[PDB]
Amino acid sequence: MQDAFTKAIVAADLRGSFLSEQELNQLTNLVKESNKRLDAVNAITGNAAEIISDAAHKLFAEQTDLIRPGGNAYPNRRMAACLRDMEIILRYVSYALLAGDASVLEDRCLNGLKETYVALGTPTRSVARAVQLMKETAIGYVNSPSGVTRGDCSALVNEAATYFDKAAASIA
Amino acid sequence: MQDAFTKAIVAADLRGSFLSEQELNQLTNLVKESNKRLDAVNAITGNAAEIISDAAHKLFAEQTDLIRPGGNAYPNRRMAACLRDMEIILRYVSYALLAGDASVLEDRCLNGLKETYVALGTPTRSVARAVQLMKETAIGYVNSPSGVTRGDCSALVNEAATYFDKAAASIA
Amino acid sequence: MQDAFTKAIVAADLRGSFLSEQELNQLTNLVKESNKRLDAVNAITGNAAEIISDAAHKLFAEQTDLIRPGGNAYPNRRMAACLRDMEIILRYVSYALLAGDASVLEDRCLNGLKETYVALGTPTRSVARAVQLMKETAIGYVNSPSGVTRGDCSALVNEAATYFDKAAASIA
Amino acid sequence: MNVLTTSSQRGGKLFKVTMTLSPALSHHPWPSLDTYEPSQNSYSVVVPLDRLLAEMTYIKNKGGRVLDISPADLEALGPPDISSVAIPLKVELWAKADVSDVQAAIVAAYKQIFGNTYVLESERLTSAESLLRNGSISVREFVRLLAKSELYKERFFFCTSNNRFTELNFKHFLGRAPYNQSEIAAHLDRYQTFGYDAEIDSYIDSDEYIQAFGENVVPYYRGFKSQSGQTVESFNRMFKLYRGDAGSDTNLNLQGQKRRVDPKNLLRSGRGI
Amino acid sequence: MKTVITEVIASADSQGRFLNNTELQAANGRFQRATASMEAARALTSNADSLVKGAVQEVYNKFPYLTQPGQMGYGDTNQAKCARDISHYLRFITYSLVAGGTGPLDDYIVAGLREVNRTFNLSPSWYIEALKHIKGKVGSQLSGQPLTEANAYIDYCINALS
Amino acid sequence: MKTVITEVIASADSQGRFLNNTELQAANGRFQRATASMEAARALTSNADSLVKGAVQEVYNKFPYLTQPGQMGYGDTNQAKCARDISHYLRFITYSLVAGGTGPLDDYIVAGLREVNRTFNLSPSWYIEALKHIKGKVGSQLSGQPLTEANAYIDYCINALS
Amino acid sequence: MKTVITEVIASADSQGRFLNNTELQAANGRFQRATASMEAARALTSNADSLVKGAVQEVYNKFPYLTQPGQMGYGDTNQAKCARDISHYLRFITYSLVAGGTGPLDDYIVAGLREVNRTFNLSPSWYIEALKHIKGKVGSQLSGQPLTEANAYIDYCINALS
Amino acid sequence: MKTVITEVIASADSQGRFLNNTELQAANGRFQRATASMEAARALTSNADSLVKGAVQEVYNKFPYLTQPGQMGYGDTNQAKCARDISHYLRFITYSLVAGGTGPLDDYIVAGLREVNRTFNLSPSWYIEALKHIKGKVGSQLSGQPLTEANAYIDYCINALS
Amino acid sequence: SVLTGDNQQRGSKLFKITIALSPTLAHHPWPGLDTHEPSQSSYSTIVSLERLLPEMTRIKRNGGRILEITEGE
Ligand SMILES: *[C@H](C)[C@H]1/C(=C/c2[nH]c(/C=C3N=C(/C=C4\NC(=O)C(CC)=C4C)C(C)=C\3CCC(=O)O)c(CCC(=O)O)c2C)NC(=O)[C@@H]1C
Ligand SMILES: *[C@H](C)[C@H]1/C(=C/c2[nH]c(/C=C3N=C(/C=C4\NC(=O)C(CC)=C4C)C(C)=C\3CCC(=O)O)c(CCC(=O)O)c2C)NC(=O)[C@@H]1C
Ligand SMILES: *[C@H](C)[C@H]1/C(=C/c2[nH]c(/C=C3N=C(/C=C4\NC(=O)C(CC)=C4C)C(C)=C\3CCC(=O)O)c(CCC(=O)O)c2C)NC(=O)[C@@H]1C
Ligand SMILES: *[C@H](C)[C@H]1/C(=C/c2[nH]c(/C=C3N=C(/C=C4\NC(=O)C(CC)=C4C)C(C)=C\3CCC(=O)O)c(CCC(=O)O)c2C)NC(=O)[C@@H]1C
Ligand SMILES: *[C@H](C)[C@H]1/C(=C/c2[nH]c(/C=C3N=C(/C=C4\NC(=O)C(CC)=C4C)C(C)=C\3CCC(=O)O)c(CCC(=O)O)c2C)NC(=O)[C@@H]1C
Ligand SMILES: *[C@H](C)[C@H]1/C(=C/c2[nH]c(/C=C3N=C(/C=C4\NC(=O)C(CC)=C4C)C(C)=C\3CCC(=O)O)c(CCC(=O)O)c2C)NC(=O)[C@@H]1C
Ligand SMILES: *[C@H](C)[C@H]1/C(=C/c2[nH]c(/C=C3N=C(/C=C4\NC(=O)C(CC)=C4C)C(C)=C\3CCC(=O)O)c(CCC(=O)O)c2C)NC(=O)[C@@H]1C
Ligand SMILES: *[C@H](C)[C@H]1/C(=C/c2[nH]c(/C=C3N=C(/C=C4\NC(=O)C(CC)=C4C)C(C)=C\3CCC(=O)O)c(CCC(=O)O)c2C)NC(=O)[C@@H]1C
Ligand SMILES: *[C@H](C)[C@H]1/C(=C/c2[nH]c(/C=C3N=C(/C=C4\NC(=O)C(CC)=C4C)C(C)=C\3CCC(=O)O)c(CCC(=O)O)c2C)NC(=O)[C@@H]1C
Ligand SMILES: *[C@H](C)[C@H]1/C(=C/c2[nH]c(/C=C3N=C(/C=C4\NC(=O)C(CC)=C4C)C(C)=C\3CCC(=O)O)c(CCC(=O)O)c2C)NC(=O)[C@@H]1C
Ligand SMILES: *[C@H](C)[C@H]1/C(=C/c2[nH]c(/C=C3N=C(/C=C4\NC(=O)C(CC)=C4C)C(C)=C\3CCC(=O)O)c(CCC(=O)O)c2C)NC(=O)[C@@H]1C
Ligand SMILES: *[C@H](C)[C@H]1/C(=C/c2[nH]c(/C=C3N=C(/C=C4\NC(=O)C(CC)=C4C)C(C)=C\3CCC(=O)O)c(CCC(=O)O)c2C)NC(=O)[C@@H]1C
Secondary structure, eight states: OOOHHHHHHHHHHHHTOOOOHHHHHHHHHHHHHHHHHHHHHHHHHHHHHHHHHHHHHHHHHHOGGGGSTTSSSOSHHHHHHHHHHHHHHHHHHHHHHHHTSSHHIIIIIITTHHHHHHHHTOOHHHHHHHHHHHHHHHHHHHHSOSSSOOOOOHHHHHHHHHHHHHHHHHHO | OOOHHHHHHHHHHHHTOOOOHHHHHHHHHHHHHHHHHHHHHHHHHHHHHHHHHHHHHHHHHHOGGGGSTTSSSOSHHHHHHHHHHHHHHHHHHHHHHHHTOSHHHIIIIITTHHHHHHHHTOOHHHHHHHHHHHHHHHHHHHHSOSSSOOOOOHHHHHHHHHHHHHHHHHHO | OOOHHHHHHHHHHHHTOOOOHHHHHHHHHHHHHHHHHHHHHHHHHHHHHHHHHHHHHHHHHHOGGGGSTTSSSOSHHHHHHHHHHHHHHHHHHHHHHHHTSSHHIIIIIITTHHHHHHHHTOOHHHHHHHHHHHHHHHHHHHHSOSSOOOOOOHHHHHHHHHHHHHHHHHHO | OOOSOSBOSSSOBOEEEEEEOOTTTSOOSSSSSOOOOGGGSEEEEEEOHHHHHHHHHHHHHTTOEEEEEEETTTSSOOOOOOHHHHSOOOEEOOTTOOHHHHHHHHHHHHHHHTTTOOOOTTTSOHHHHHHTTSSSSOHHHHHHHHTTSHHHIIIIITSSOHHHHHHHHHHHHSSSOOOSHHHHHHHHHHHHHTOHHHHHHHHHHSSHHHHEEOSSEEOOOOTTSOOTTOOHHHHHHHHHHOOOSSOOOOSTTTTOOOOSSOHHHHHHHOOOO | OOOHHHHHHHHHHHHTOOOOHHHHHHHHHHHHHHHHHHHHHHHHHHHHHHHHHHHHHHHHHHSGGGGSTTSSSOSHHHHHHHHHHHHHHHHHHHHHHHHTSSHHHIIIIITTHHHHHHHHTOOHHHHHHHHHHHHHHHHHHOOHHHHHHHHHHHHHHHHHHO | OOOHHHHHHHHHHHHTOOOOHHHHHHHHHHHHHHHHHHHHHHHHHHHHHHHHHHHHHHHHHHSGGGGSTTSSSOSHHHHHHHHHHHHHHHHHHHHHHHHTSSHHHIIIIITTHHHHHHHHTOOHHHHHHHHHHHHHHHHHHOOHHHHHHHHHHHHHHHHHHO | OOOHHHHHHHHHHHHTOOOOHHHHHHHHHHHHTHHHHHHHHHHHHHHHHHHHHHHHHHHHHHSGGGGSTTSSSOSHHHHHHHHHHHHHHHHHHHHHHHHTSSHHHIIIIITTHHHHHHHHTOOHHHHHHHHHHHHHHHHHHOOHHHHHHHHHHHHHHHHHHO | OOOHHHHHHHHHHHHTOOOOHHHHHHHHHHHHHHHHHHHHHHHHHHHHHHHHHHHHHHHHHHSGGGGSTTSSSOSHHHHHHHHHHHHHHHHHHHHHHHHTSSHHHIIIIITTHHHHHHHHTOOHHHHHHHHHHHHHHHHHHOOHHHHHHHHHHHHHHHHHHO | OOOSSOOOSSOSOEEEEEEEOOTTTTOOSOSSSOOOOSTTSEEEEEEEHHHHHHHHHHHHHSSOOEEEEEEOO
16 A cells, blocks of 8 residues: 555655655655644544435435435435445545545545446446535534644645545546 | 385484485385286276175175165165265275375274264274275285286285275274 | 453453542553553564574574484474474564563463474473573563663563563463 | 457557547438447457557547557457366365475465465465464365455455455455356445455355365365356356466556456346345 | 554564564554543543433433333433443443553444344434533533543444444 | 554454544554654765765675675675665665655565575675664664664664574 | 375375376386486495585585684584584485485475574575585496486475575 | 376476476386387277277177167167267277376266266166277287286276266 | 464454364365265364354254364363
């Protein structure tokens, strides 16, 4: 697997060189943000259940047909699958967020997912919508916690977004 | 597994010594007999089917109850097993005969056979009997071939016997 | 599995009670020693290869016969095993040392070890000896390191001993 | 599709391109809206290296998009020989096994359990080997330790998706390929709730295991030869899952862990649930 | 039982390798954090009771009908149980903080949670409120990292329950 | 590549569960340590060369016969290689410090070490000395935790080599 | 133990089939060869000692520094060992010739060779020379097939060692 | 296909090792025997026909009723088949001799023998006689090892049939 | 089979089960009626409490019956 640190290493390796001082300073600062980074993750994990629950409600309100007989979410078993899928995507996203790298996410979570959905007949599009729905709710928590020292999380927030979006895109 | 040669080696090893000249002369002569040895084996294998067929007939003529309802060779299913077993034992015996050593026979075939038979309720006695019946028939062939160079096979014949007997004994 | 903390918990659980303040103070102080604890472990792991190498040399100088034909450490194959085993035991001991609890060591490693050794014909006595030889060498490093803040490690050193000894005893 | 010549009359490596056709790219000469013909939704042409650039751009500039490109030498190659997997071979570990016989079961177990994937000396597992050969562990139990090992998770499970890891498991633990989406779905769910250890157990625990290569027989390739309750497609799947000898399952290759068995093929053999 | 320390051992063990620097780093993390964790536990342990009363109570306000006759909230036995239960959860939460892992929670509370609750018709919802109410109170007695820790664990249950 | 961060993800992933408090604790550990680790790397990176010269050299003192004609140490090509090699090990060690795990070391250096060395008849011993000599020098430029870290990793190789 | 005879039995046994012509053909091959093999063994057995002396010696010429104090070749104990070892290899080689398979070699010498050698820092190289020197001497006392056989086995070890 | 040569390769291959002395010994066996084997084949090939006639015939003597109308032996078609078959059996036996293994026999004749025979109600017995009668004739044209070989293979089928 | 150490890497309380063995449970890879090994009519395997239920159920449906259960330790 890979993450922010490891990555930079690898790059350096192919040049055949010790790390640039400049490059260290990327990592040095990355460290400093850790604490912020962590809390971000913590927030997602803490609210997981909810995030999904929420997103689902909205997805079904929008695309009524999903829950109608003949739709992809019907019946129960299919509905359960749809909920399960949302969780899986989320879980990975979180992982990435901690790593500070998309890779992990791109590998197990998404590589191949789109094709599966097409064969199944689940509308890749609808799933993508849900991924976004999730995104927004999630950010909601990341960005509005309680008992944390107040400061700027934007940097992290955006990176979070990106992860969600890579997801949305590759699925779609 | 083990055989005549390997064995002698192992012994020698524990003493920590080169092979004694005396000991070589066992193996040297063993080689010389090879050709005879081989033909012996060949004779069994060639006649296998028959050997068994024969032995069985005789076994069942003697112990009529085995094939009666309530006996151990009834019904078909069981009968089949019983035939199969006889064969196996034979197979091993042959193996040994070639190796020039009981081991293979004892380890992969005989060991624990008795107890199995007991647990099942198979009468070990009868099994043993069958083995002998086989023995006699087998020797019959080993000892009376056609188109082989005429000579004395006794030495081999006896060793053959012994193998059969170890079988009979351990089963019984 | 188990370790110092978890253990105390479990005890508390059966009484059905919150942890006593007294009991917390065991753990509180245990924490404080952490740093010492860690370095101890680090020292073993760092020197692992050597520890063994050393112990072995001494073991074989003493019990010459192990390496003689007919002995238990001969031939190569066996020797290899014997080295491997020593290492394993070590590995576990270390684990315990970190956990702050014998359990892990007893359950994963020691349990059934004696009987194995017996069945094989491995002389348990000698095994035990080796474990001690290791012990002494190991302590050697734990207690004489480089770059570490000077202070008292005794407490840890003794606990280390105990682990080694449980090993020695149960094997023996 | 089959390509009939590897190289153009003028020297030039032919490449086989596959595209999703679009109405603009080819259309019937009828009145009314332009339609391509349905049977050629995925069209394939073989182009020399020289025309490849222009051909690909034209495809993309229209609504087309390139499913994949592949050298025509690799394509237009024999389907893998099944000689070695038609009759697997089969290894039994007897009780009171010789030093050598235990070795030979260990090797066989690595080869089957890990795909032709190579296992380095540092990767190999002394501890689980140690248990076999003094008794205490079955062949079946050793196999369960391998599929619990990190080495196994690193290759097959941590890089690829669960949907691929499933078939990848079906191959290693049972010769068979997967048959019907139902199977893939059940494993995915079991993994979500029970987790990775339970999933692994469920293959070794399952009745096909034990009914075949029950205990103390290293698992061997059952597929490629007709099995009970095995859809025919499954036999073709096996040809996708198993490419040759000295073909592996590698995380190491470019985009290493993809799905050999297209999800639409599974749905053919049985769709429902 | 899953704690930081147990896990790294486990991972090391599976690999078949000595604990190297990688794992120790991790361990170190657990120990540094402990100081905060421990503090939180001392705080919960002390106010236990009061938290419990408040919670139980809350639940009833939230779900009045429970206290009506023929319901579950009704008749002292049930109330006693309800109390007990919440108290048990708190004890495990304190245990977890100290152990430095979800371990204790997982094994006592979480595993089998669903089926128990199904067979006895305990509605997760209830428990949840209890917890939430608690969380709110805890959000006064504690502050900074100590607080953060307390939350994490409390939540972990919410998520498991839901 | 095994670093603290990758591992906990892996473990979390296998069980099929969210990263909970347990793992974050571990992560935290890695980050706190980094400051020391990073320092050590800056120190090695700077003195690289000098360390290398000194090491290569040492080896020859230790094993005079290597420099004799018909041996491995003999003729510049080999010397060049010998230099190169030591530098590669150092580069991975610097990478490891920064990555906060043995990962980089394992994958580049360690895996396949034996067979390479066997087929080309490189004697582990040599490398070892190199390292030791290094360790000794490093034992001046560094101090406290930074030092400790440097050692850990250097050793880790000694053990792998032997 | 792997010899021709054991193997065919094994193969026969696995399939669950009687020894048929196929296997006997193989057997015939062995035992025909034996006459040459046996001869070779008688020759090695007799000159054992002398071969050993010569070998040990050789090694020292080849690697002078070994005999210097503080080295491995130095001090009688080590010399004794060195002798012992070479003698063991020879005994297994004689055993193999007679057994008519590599079996004896594999199980005593080869299996675990590497790790033993690693942990005690025995350099394969040495052994090799020993063998080579031997091979050279044997290349006088023997001739034709007997010789060929002797070589095969001697080499087999060279390859295993390297 | 199972021949001596293929097998040793297979065994070598499984263990993952080069062909060492062990296997070559075996191979040698196959080659030396071939001279006899080959001779036998030339003899059978030549007299084929005559053997076949004699056999078919025999069968009828042995089982008169077969030639009666409404039976299987009756009407030329069947006789033709009967001839064909025995000729096929003979051809496979000749093939095996040359290949130096049962291989050819196993794959063509033996595998699936039973079920074929069951579904078409071919009585093994018949074939057997054919073979036996053959064996008897062959027992004149051949002698010594050539003969021995011929027998082995002929029998191998008898056993498979029965 | 006497446990040389805790077999299972994943850790719970471990129990030693001894079973009478049907031919089905451990059929040999042989032609004709498959035969469980003679040497071990009674296989004996240590099992984690977690895997104990499955193992028993699978043993049950297969002919073989549990001779005796004993805690591994
Ligand atoms: C929910 C947001 C939307 C939705 C989901 C949905 N999925 C399925 C069925 C499956 N999903 C998968 C996909 C995966 N394979 C993997 O490896 C992973 C993890 C990386 C995933 C997520 C698979 C294999 C299936 C097949 C069956 C199963 O449950 O596993 C369904 C059920 C429909 C069907 O099975 O045909 C649904 C509903 N689709 C929607 O309608 C939502 C918008
Ligand atoms: C960002 C979305 C939100 C935010 C975060 C924020 N956090 C801190 C500081 C800390 N947060 C933690 C949390 C952890 N550290 C760990 O090791 C773990 C795992 C057990 C956690 C959960 C810690 C310890 C700190 C340091 C002390 C503190 O609480 O302040 C800050 C301060 C700035 C900085 O860290 O450089 C900030 C800004 N604040 C926001 O704006 C969001 C609510
Ligand atoms: C035949 C002469 C007598 C006889 C045989 C018989 N055996 C069984 C059952 C078994 N026999 C064996 C023997 C072996 N199995 C092996 O694997 C080996 C080689 C290593 C041997 C020699 C075994 C294991 C069984 C049990 C399982 C099986 O079905 O094979 C039966 C049937 C017992 C039953 O009740 O099913 C019989 C009849 N018993 C007689 O009646 C004959 C005198
Ligand atoms: C002994 C039970 C009966 C017997 C045997 C016998 N055989 C020979 C000689 C040979 N037998 C063989 C046979 C083989 N050699 C092989 O390599 C194989 C497998 C492919 C076989 C089966 C051979 C080749 C010989 C050598 C000479 C020959 O052509 O026969 C003898 C003669 C003594 C000797 O060993 O030289 C004997 C006595 N013959 C009997 O009458 C016994 C009842
Ligand atoms: C070395 C100091 C002594 C010695 C060791 C020795 N051990 C074996 C064989 C084994 N030892 C073990 C040990 C373990 N099994 C486990 O599960 C664990 C704990 C988790 C350990 C450490 C086992 C399993 C075996 C059997 C399998 C194997 O090949 O190792 C031997 C070889 C026995 C043989 O004759 O083949 C030896 C030599 N014996 C000595 O001579 C030293 C005193
Ligand atoms: C005990 C056998 C010897 C000894 C130990 C000792 N260590 C310290 C202090 C520390 N040791 C460490 C080491 C680590 N902390 C980590 O997080 C890791 C893993 C990456 C390690 C290896 C640390 C950080 C400290 C604190 C700072 C320091 O090094 O001083 C002490 C000082 C007392 C204390 O408890 O802090 C001591 C005594 N010293 C000896 O003399 C013994 C031979
Ligand atoms: C209408 C009842 C339903 C429907 C049809 C629909 N089809 C398309 C697009 C295509 N349909 C075809 C069909 C054919 N092409 C052929 O040549 C033939 C006969 C030989 C058929 C039957 C094809 C190939 C296309 C794609 C390319 C093209 O335009 O020809 C659409 C539009 C799909 C799009 O997104 O472009 C639709 C809507 N779908 C419905 O909504 C109805 C249920
Ligand atoms: C060496 C001359 C060149 C080279 C080779 C190379 N190979 C790999 C990886 C693999 N190589 C194979 C090869 C085979 N698999 C087989 O089973 C057989 C025949 C039975 C062969 C020959 C396989 C399976 C792999 C994949 C698994 C593995 O980990 O090796 C690599 C490594 C690829 C990677 O990116 O990890 C290399 C380097 N490459 C060179 O540099 C030489 C020109
Ligand atoms: C409180 C919010 C509500 C309530 C609870 C209540 N619980 C039960 C019965 C049980 N509750 C539990 C819960 C636990 N027992 C444990 O050991 C653990 C793990 C530490 C937990 C979480 C259990 C197991 C039971 C079942 C039987 C028992 O005696 O434990 C009841 C009784 C319901 C019944 O007996 O059917 C009640 C009422 N009581 C209230 O007033 C609230 C609505
Ligand atoms: C220095 C102590 C001695 C020395 C070294 C030396 N090395 C080689 C050849 C190689 N060295 C390596 C080492 C590495 N290459 C890698 O890829 C890695 C991981 C980053 C390492 C550790 C390798 C692989 C080779 C072999 C291939 C190559 O050409 O690089 C030699 C040459 C020996 C030969 O060509 O057979 C030498 C001499 N030089 C000395 O004189 C010291 C005794
Ligand atoms: C001779 C070229 C050099 C030499 C050798 C030497 N060997 C050792 C120690 C061991 N050598 C072996 C080798 C074997 N023992 C066996 O039983 C077998 C298989 C049958 C072999 C090949 C082993 C196992 C050892 C380990 C301990 C032991 O002596 O049994 C040493 C001693 C090194 C030490 O300090 O332990 C030496 C010196 N002696 C020389 O002088 C040459 C350089
Ligand atoms: C001769 C002793 C008796 C006899 C034979 C006979 N055979 C068949 C039919 C078949 N014979 C075979 C045999 C083979 N064909 C092969 O390819 C091989 C393997 C190389 C063998 C051994 C087969 C396969 C058949 C079935 C298909 C076919 O039609 O050939 C018959 C006809 C049976 C029918 O129902 O059609 C007969 C009569 N005929 C005699 O007169 C003897 C009693």
